[PDB]
């Protein structure tokens, strides 16, 4: 019950990836900033969990 919910929460929290420029979160399979301030970096890192 709880653990399933936790996963869901994570999916709408952790999973999204960020751009090394904004640190703005796009989505978990992304290839771009899709923002004009970044300059559309396309050089993303995944969001670091509480494990790491």
């Amino acid at each position: 019950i709880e653990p399933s919910l936790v996963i869901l929460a994570r999916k709408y929290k952790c999973d999204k990836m960020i751009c090394r420029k904004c640190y703005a979160r796009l989505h978990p399979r992304a290839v771009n900033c899709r923002k004009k301030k970044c300059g559309h970096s396309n050089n993303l890192r995944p969001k670091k969990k509480l494990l790491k």
């Binding site: 936790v6 869901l8 929460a9 994570r10 929290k13 952790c14 509480l50």
Partner: peptide, 21 residues
Amino acid sequence: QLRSAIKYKDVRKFLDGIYVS
């Protein structure tokens, strides 16, 4: 969903709130 989250301090201290299932 937006309204039921914690807008100050860690996003993983709470994973809590109402979300779509």
